[PDB]
Amino acid sequence: ELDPNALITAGALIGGGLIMGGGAIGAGIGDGIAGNALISGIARQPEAQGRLFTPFFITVGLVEAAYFINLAFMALFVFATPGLQ
Amino acid sequence: ELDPNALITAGALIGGGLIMGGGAIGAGIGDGIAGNALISGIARQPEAQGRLFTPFFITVGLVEAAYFINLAFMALFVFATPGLQ
Amino acid sequence: ELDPNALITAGALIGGGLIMGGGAIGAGIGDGIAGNALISGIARQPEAQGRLFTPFFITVGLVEAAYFINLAFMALFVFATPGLQ
Amino acid sequence: ELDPNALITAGALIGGGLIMGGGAIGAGIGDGIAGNALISGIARQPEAQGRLFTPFFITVGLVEAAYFINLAFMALFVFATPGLQ
Amino acid sequence: ELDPNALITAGALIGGGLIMGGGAIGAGIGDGIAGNALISGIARQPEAQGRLFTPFFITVGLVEAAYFINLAFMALFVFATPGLQ
Amino acid sequence: ELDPNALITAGALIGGGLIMGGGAIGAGIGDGIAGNALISGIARQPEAQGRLFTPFFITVGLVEAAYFINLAFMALFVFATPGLQ
Amino acid sequence: ELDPNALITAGALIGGGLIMGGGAIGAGIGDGIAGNALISGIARQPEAQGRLFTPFFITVGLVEAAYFINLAFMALFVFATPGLQ
Amino acid sequence: ELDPNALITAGALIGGGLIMGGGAIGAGIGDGIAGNALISGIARQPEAQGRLFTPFFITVGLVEAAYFINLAFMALFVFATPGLQ
Amino acid sequence: ELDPNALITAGALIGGGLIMGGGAIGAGIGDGIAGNALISGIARQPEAQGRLFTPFFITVGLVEAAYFINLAFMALFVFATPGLQ
Ligand SMILES: COc1nc2ccc(I)cc2cc1[C@@H](c1ccccc1)[C@@](O)(CCN(C)C)c1cccc2ccccc12
Ligand SMILES: COc1nc2ccc(I)cc2cc1[C@@H](c1ccccc1)[C@@](O)(CCN(C)C)c1cccc2ccccc12
Ligand SMILES: COc1nc2ccc(I)cc2cc1[C@@H](c1ccccc1)[C@@](O)(CCN(C)C)c1cccc2ccccc12
Numbered sequence: 001e002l003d004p005n006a007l008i009t010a011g012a013l014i015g016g017g018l019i020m021g022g023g024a025i026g027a028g029i030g031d032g033i034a035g036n037a038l039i040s041g042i043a044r045q046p047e048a049q050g051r052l053f054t055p056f057f058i059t060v061g062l063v064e065a066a067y068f069i070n071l072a073f074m075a076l077f078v079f080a081t082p083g084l085q
Numbered sequence: 086e087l088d089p090n091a092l093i094t095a096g097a098l099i100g101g102g103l104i105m106g107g108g109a110i111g112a113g114i115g116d117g118i119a120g121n122a123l124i125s126g127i128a129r130q131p132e133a134q135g136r137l138f139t140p141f142f143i144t145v146g147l148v149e150a151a152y153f154i155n156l157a158f159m160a161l162f163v164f165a166t167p168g169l170q
Numbered sequence: 171e172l173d174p175n176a177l178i179t180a181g182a183l184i185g186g187g188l189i190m191g192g193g194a195i196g197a198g199i200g201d202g203i204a205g206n207a208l209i210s211g212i213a214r215q216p217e218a219q220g221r222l223f224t225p226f227f228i229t230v231g232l233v234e235a236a237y238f239i240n241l242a243f244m245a246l247f248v249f250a251t252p253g254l255q
Numbered sequence: 256e257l258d259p260n261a262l263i264t265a266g267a268l269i270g271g272g273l274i275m276g277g278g279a280i281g282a283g284i285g286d287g288i289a290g291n292a293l294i295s296g297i298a299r300q301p302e303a304q305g306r307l308f309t310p311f312f313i314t315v316g317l318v319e320a321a322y323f324i325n326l327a328f329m330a331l332f333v334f335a336t337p338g339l340q
Numbered sequence: 341e342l343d344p345n346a347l348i349t350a351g352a353l354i355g356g357g358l359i360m361g362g363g364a365i366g367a368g369i370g371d372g373i374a375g376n377a378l379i380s381g382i383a384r385q386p387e388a389q390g391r392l393f394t395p396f397f398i399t400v401g402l403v404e405a406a407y408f409i410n411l412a413f414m415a416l417f418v419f420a421t422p423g424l425q
Numbered sequence: 426e427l428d429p430n431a432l433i434t435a436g437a438l439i440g441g442g443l444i445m446g447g448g449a450i451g452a453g454i455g456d457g458i459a460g461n462a463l464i465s466g467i468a469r470q471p472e473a474q475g476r477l478f479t480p481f482f483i484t485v486g487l488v489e490a491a492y493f494i495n496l497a498f499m500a501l502f503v504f505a506t507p508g509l510q
Numbered sequence: 511e512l513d514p515n516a517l518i519t520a521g522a523l524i525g526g527g528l529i530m531g532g533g534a535i536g537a538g539i540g541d542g543i544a545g546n547a548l549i550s551g552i553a554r555q556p557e558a559q560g561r562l563f564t565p566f567f568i569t570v571g572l573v574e575a576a577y578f579i580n581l582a583f584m585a586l587f588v589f590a591t592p593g594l595q
Numbered sequence: 596e597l598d599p600n601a602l603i604t605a606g607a608l609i610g611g612g613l614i615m616g617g618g619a620i621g622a623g624i625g626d627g628i629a630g631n632a633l634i635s636g637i638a639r640q641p642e643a644q645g646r647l648f649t650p651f652f653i654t655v656g657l658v659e660a661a662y663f664i665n666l667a668f669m670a671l672f673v674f675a676t677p678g679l680q
Numbered sequence: 681e682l683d684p685n686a687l688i689t690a691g692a693l694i695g696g697g698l699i700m701g702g703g704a705i706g707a708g709i710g711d712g713i714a715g716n717a718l719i720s721g722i723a724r725q726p727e728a729q730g731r732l733f734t735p736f737f738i739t740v741g742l743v744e745a746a747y748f749i750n751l752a753f754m755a756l757f758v759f760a761t762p763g764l765q
Contacts, residue, residue, distance in 0.1 A: 001683070002683075003086070003087075003684050004086075004087055004090070004091030005763070007087060007094075007095045009763035010095060010687045011095025011691065012095075013694070013757060013762075014098070014099050014102065014695045015101055015102030016102065016757075017102070017696060017697065017698030018099070018103055018695075019109075020698070021106060021617075021698035021700075021750075022106025022107060023106070023109045023702070024699070024703040024705070024706040024707075024747065025702045025706045027109075027710075027742075027743075028703070028705070028706020028709065028711075028743045028747065029114050029709050029710050030116060030117030030710075031117065031742040031743050032117070032743050033710075033713055034124065035714045035717065035735060035736070035739025035740075036713050036739070037122075037124035037125045037128075038124055038735045038739070039721055039732055039735045040125065040720065040721060041124055041129075042128070043725050043729075044129070044725075045129075046725070046731055048128045048131060049731065052127060055124045055127050055134075056124055059120025059121075059123065060120075060742065062112075063117055064742075066108070066112040066113045066116070066152060067109065067113065067746060069156075070106070070109045073105055077098060077163075078695075081098070082163045083090070083163065083166065086171060087171060089175070092180050093183070096179065099184050099187065100185075101183075101187065102187070103184070103188055107190065107193070107194045107276075108194045110198070110199075111194040111195045111196070111197055115197075115199050115201060115203075116202065119202045119205045122207075122208075122209035122213075123209055125213075129213060130213060133212075136212060136213070136216060137209055137213055140205060140208045140209045141205070141209055144202065144204075144205025144206075144209065145205075147197075147201040147230060147234075148198045148205075151193075152194065154194075158244070162187070162248075167249055168179035168182065168183070171256065172257055173256070173257075174257055174260070177265045178261050178264050178265055180265060181266065181268040181269050182268045184268070184269050185268035185272025185273075185333075187272065188269070189275045191276055192275065192276025192277055192278070192280045193276070193279040193283070195279070195280050196282060196284055199284050200283035200285075201283075203284065204294065207291040207293075211297070214298055215298050215299075218298075218301045219298075221297055221304065222294055225290060225297055226294055228290065229286060229289070229293070229294070230290075232286040232290070233287050233290075236279045236286070237283065239279075240276075240279045243275055243329070247268060247272070253264035253268070254264075255258075255260070255261065257341075258342075259345070260346075262342060262349075263350055266351065266352070266354050267350075270353035270354050270357030271357065272357070273361035274364075275361075277364045277365045277446075278361070280365050281366070282368050284368065286368075288373055289375045289376060291376060292375065292376035292377075292380045292383075295383070296379055300384075303382070306382055310375065310378045310379045310382050314371060314374075315375075317367075317371040317375070317400060317404075318368045318372055332356075332357070332418075336353070337353075337418045337419055338421065340345070341426060342426060344428050344430070344431035345431070348431050348434045351434065351436065355439050356438075356442065359442050359445045359446050359449075361446060362445065362450045363453070365453070365454075366449040366450045366452055366454055367449075370456060370457030373454070377461040377464035380468075381464055381468030385468060388467075388468050391471060395460060395467050398460065398463075402456040402460070402489075403452075403456050403457050403460075406452040406453045407453065410449045413445055413496075413499070417438060422434075422503045422504055423434035423437065423503065425428075425430070425434075426511065427511065428512075429516030432512060432516045432517060433516050433519050433520055433523070436519065439523070439527065440524045440526055440588075441527060443524070443528055443530070443531035444527045444534070446531055448530075450535050451535045452534075454538065454539050455537075455538035455542030455543075456538075456542060458539065458542035458543055458545075459542045459546060462545065462546040462547075462548075462549035462553075465550065466553030470554075470556070473553075476552055477552060480549045480552055481549055483545065484542060484544070484548070484549070487537075487541040487545070487570065491577060492538065494534075495530055495534045508591065510516065511596070512596075513597075514596075514597055514601030515601075517601045518601055520605060521604065521605025521608040524608070525609050525611055525612030526612065528609070528613055528616035529612045529619075531616060532615070532617060533619045535620050535624075537623050539624050540627030543624070543627035543628055543631050544627045544630045547631035547632075547634035547638075550635065551635055551637070555638050558637070558638045561641055562638055565633045565644075566630075566634055568633075569626060569629075569631075572622075572655060572659075573622075573627055576618070576622040577623065579619075579666075580615055583669070591608070592673045592674055593604035593673065595600070595604075597681060598681070599685070602686040603693070605690065606689065607690075609693070609697065610695075610697025610698075611693075611697065612697070613694070613700070614700045614704075618704045620708070621704040621707055624709050624712065625707075625708035626708075627712070628712035628713055629715045629719065632716040632720045635723075636719055636720060636723030640723060643723050643726070646722060647719055650722050654712065654714075654718065654719065657707075657715070657744075658711050658712055661703075661704040661708045661747060664704075664751075665700055665704045668700055668751075668754070672696075677693075677758045678693070678761065680683075680685070680689075
């Protein structure tokens with residue numbers, strides 16, 4: 001027979017899946033869009049290369065912070081579930 | 086045997102996952118898109134570097150406010166669940 | 171055991187989650203896209219850019235109204251739940 | 256113990272959340288994409304400004320009609336739930 | 341005590357929300373994208389204004405047909421639910 | 426109390442909803458994107474545009490076939506439910 | 511009263527709806543984006559028409575293979591459900 | 596009367612549908628985007644045809660690997676379900 | 681009848697599904713977008729293209745790390761389920 005934590009943990013795993021699924025959508029498309037501009041800018045001005053890598057890494061850093069903060073809360077959700085009985 | 090808060094807490098965790106999962110989609114894609122204009126603009130005109138960071142950080146400011154306001158409401162949902170019995 | 175409001179509040183948290191999740195996806199990406207144009211236009215026409223912040227704030231105003239109307243209805247769902255028993 | 260309206264109302268709130276979540280995604284990204292073209296067109300031809308505002312407001316009007324019609328049905332779903340017992 | 345139509349009606353309302361929530365994503369983003377070409381085209385060549393509204397309204401016609409055909413099926417789902425017992 | 430078809434019909438309405446929701450997202454946005462090209466190409470080359478309506482209708486034909494095949498399977502799910510008991 | 515296949519079949523129909531909903535999103539937007547480049551390339555070089563139709567049909571073929579393979583598994587899910595009891 | 600594998604199998608089928616539904620979104624849109632550059636590039640310079648197929652198939656290789664690795668895990672979920680009792 | 685792990689494993693398969701679904705959406709589309717730039721840049725600058733594969737593989741590296749970290753957590757959810765009883 002069920003118990004309250006079976007329901008709480010099921011919610012937690014779905015909740016955690018939503019957090020990382022959305023995190024990977026944000027990060028994969030975000031990084032690809034940042035890389036796109038990098039590849040294009042180099043293609044247009046192949047000596048611009050040096051000055052493009054700082055704006056690129058700032059963008060990626062922002063994108064990846066969302067992925068990583070999401071990851072941390074997915075870890076909280078399934079390894080230390082808030083509201084667990 | 087199930088109790089009311091088990092069900093409410095499972096809903097809270099799924100809602101909190103929706104909130105953060107949508108926040109990361111918006112943040113990563115929004116920031117990548119902004120970053121794509123920054124990188125391209127710098128590639129097109131290297132001395133516009135400083136000029137371009139101002140509208141970039143205004144833009145990133147707005148995208149990031151959506152992410153962290155969502156983060157606050159996810160924390161309300163899972164740490165101070167409204168409707169908990 | 172369960173009671174009706176456990177199920178209703180669970181639906182409310184999940185619906186509130188969809189509402190904020192969707193709101194930040196529209197907001198992050200809508201503002202990113204608006205800011206991309208702002209950044210590019212400032213890169214292209216540094217002088218006559220003041221004429222650009224005004225269409226930008228209008229766009230951002232529309233995008234943010236969607237985010238905050240959604241937020242208002244999330245609050246209603248989870249703090250004044252319609253159909254609560 | 257549960258009752259049929261607890262299940263119906265839970266469905267209604269999720270249903271309503273889906274309607275507004277999707278409404279905000281459509282409206283935020285739609286408006287941002289319309290604003291993008293507005294900001295760009297002004298940047299390219301800063302006297303085009305006058306003739307751009309009619310096509311802009313037609314686009315936004317279309318985008319916002321979807322948001323508003325969605326909002327109306329979310330209101331029906333949770334305040335006058337069809338099929339309520 | 342639950343009855344069959346409570347469950348069926350809850351499914352109907354979630355399905356109807358999916359239908360309209362996806363309709364608004366498609367309508368708002370589709371119409372914004374069409375509107376972006378209209379605005380840009382008018383900005384590029386002001387006297388193409390009349391010429392450009394024809395393919396724009398054909399395009400908006402198609403996007404809007406998806407939105408209102410979805411709206412009809414959402415109404416079938418929630419007002420004349422198939423499978424109701 | 427519940428019977429098996431209540432649960433099956435509920436799954437059917439939710440699955441039918443996903444099918445139409447997804448179909449209108451692909452259709453709204455696919456047609457918007459096709460029409461964006463049509464509008465721009467007519468703006469750029471008003472004379473030789475007749476050659477454009479033909480690739481446009483092919484694209485729209487493909488996009489609409491996805492919408493209407495989906496519609497056909499939504500109808501099957503909700504009017505001739507596979508696995509109904 | 512329920513039976514195991516009522517739950518299995520409900521899962522199957524939702525599962526099947528997810529497969530086709532996502533299939534139509536992939537195919538509608540994919541085909542529209544392929545058609546966009548076709549319409550644009552013809553508009554820019556109206557004699558390029560001949561050499562554009564092979565890359566166009568390769569792209570569409572790839573896009574449509576995802577739709578069709580998804581369709582086949584949705585057919586498996588709801589007409590020959592794996593794990594049916 | 597329900598048994599454990601009925602619930603587990605229903606979860607398996609929904610998870611397997613998520614997996615393939617997300618795979619087709621990524622594959623169709625990813626392949627359309629790659630194909631859009633191929634078509635445009637060939638339109639811009641007809642004799643670059645052979646040159647452009649190499650980076651196109653590398654790109655399509657990567658997009659398609661996501662689709663078929665997802666397909667393998669969907670098959671694991673529904674044909675060899677982990678956790679089946 | 682049911683047992684707690686039936687419900688937990690079901691949540692695990694659904695969460696694992698969200699995680700892989702999201703991962704392939706980010707990966708398909710992120711790599712498509714990166715490859716679009718690669719293809720265009722090679723079409724525009726055939727000589728100095730070697731400088732492009734290096735930003736391309738960096739972008740793809742970031743996009744694929746998101747896909748494969750997600751895959752790693754899907755495996756954890758479905759093969760070493762956190763909170764399993
Ligand atoms: C631009 O505004 C519109 N344009 C439309 C265009 C077509 C149609 I058919 C309906 C339209 C409706 C409106 C607004 C409206 C104005 C007055 C009354 C109701 C609705 C609006 O929906 C806009 C929301 N978006 C910005 C996301 C709104 C709703 C709810 C709260 C608001 C609060 C503040 C401002 C706007 C609010
Ligand atoms: C362009 O068509 C294709 N190209 C493919 C390319 C690769 C692969 I591996 C499979 C492909 C399959 C097809 C079709 C097909 C033709 C014949 C038989 C089965 C499938 C199709 O799937 C296209 C659907 N899209 C437009 C969204 C289809 C399915 C179902 C009903 C249809 C009804 C009418 C027309 C097409 C229908
Ligand atoms: C580029 O990497 C980063 N940039 C960041 C930027 C801002 C912030 I605030 C956090 C950041 C965190 C990281 C990584 C990290 C490095 C070390 C330790 C933890 C996290 C990372 O999250 C990147 C994942 N993406 C590629 C999707 C990661 C997580 C998990 C497993 C990884 C395995 C291999 C490589 C990277 C891994």
